[PDB]
Design a binder for this molecule. Structure first.
Ligand SMILES: [Ca+2]
Length: 278
């Protein structure tokens, strides 16, 4: 399929070179794959999802209603799997709410959400974590264990304009850690960087769904916006080949990535820009 006039992020990922061609081509769509969005919740009824979004668990309220009262998780989820704004337009979306209405949460609750995905994922699965905090081996262990259990984890590098290795789950060995770029292929000014990164993806001024109505959109910036582009492409690859392990997904992302495009990428950063096609 070819989507004309896509938002810039997804426009960027299906081509090697600028300028943007105002087209988002897909050969796959994330069919048969589930993307777990560990975040502020998801507005399941948003027009973007067409029924494909449902609640996993809410660790803020302690119940099964993982609706979004912040917006962040809905935006992240639309980048992964929205009809208009999304990479993988037929993926299943499951909200795992670990962040409150103000976008905050405890290490304990985030770990609870990671474990929940590990224990509940069935079939080809990817999990996205557009969130981070101070270095935590407890958090890293939970991520690494969920990955060892067969779920590809994709996480934001963080918005500190610093070495991403200082933060969890960014530094977690088996996380795919995602830095942010702009529409001219610069590292975003806020993007964390360095050897704990695996890949770069569009993260500045990304348009996607928002929680205020079933048709609402928002345009926001962050490694939190870059992460779901990568999670969405993992879902494409797992539709294409449902037999890939997380390690094989990681390798395929890296071998398929566009090389040597990111300017000001910083010492130790992999100069790899997300590429969605096979
Ligand atoms: Ca394009």
């Amino acid at each position: 399929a070819d989507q004309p006039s896509p938002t810039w992020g997804i426009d960027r990922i299906d081509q090697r070179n600028l300028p943007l061609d105002n087209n988002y081509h897909t050969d796959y769509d994330g069919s048969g794959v589930t993307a777990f969005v560990i975040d502020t919740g998801v507005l399941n009824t948003h027009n973007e999802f067409g029924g494909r979004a449902s609640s996993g668990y809410d660790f803020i309220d302690n119940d099964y209603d993982a609706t979004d009262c912040n917006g962040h998780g809905t935006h992240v989820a639309g980048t992964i799997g929205g009809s208009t704004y999304g990479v993988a337009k037929n993926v299943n979306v499951v909200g795992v709410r670990v962040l409150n209405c103000s976008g905050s949460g405890s290490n304990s609750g985030v770990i609870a959400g990671i474990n929940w995905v590990k224990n509940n994922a069935s079939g080809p699965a990817v999990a996205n974590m557009s969130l981070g905090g101070g270095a935590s081996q407890a958090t890293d262990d939970a991520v690494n264990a969920a990955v060892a259990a067969g779920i590809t984890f994709v996480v934001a590098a963080g918005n500190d304009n610093s070495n991403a290795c200082n933060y969890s789950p960014a530094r977690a060995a088996d996380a795919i850690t995602v830095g942010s770029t702009t529409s001219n292929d610069s590292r975003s000014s806020f993007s964390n960087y360095g050897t704990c990164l695996d890949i770069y993806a569009p993260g500045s001024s990304i348009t996607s769904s928002w929680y205020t109505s079933n048709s609402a959109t928002n345009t926001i910036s962050g490694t939190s916006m870059a992460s779901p582009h990568v999670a969405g492409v993992a879902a494409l690859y797992l539709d294409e080949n449902p037999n890939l392990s997380p390690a094989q997904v990681t390798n395929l992302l890296k071998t398929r990535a566009t090389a040597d495009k990111v300017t000001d990428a910083k010492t130790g950063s992999p100069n790899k820009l997300l590429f969605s096609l096979a």
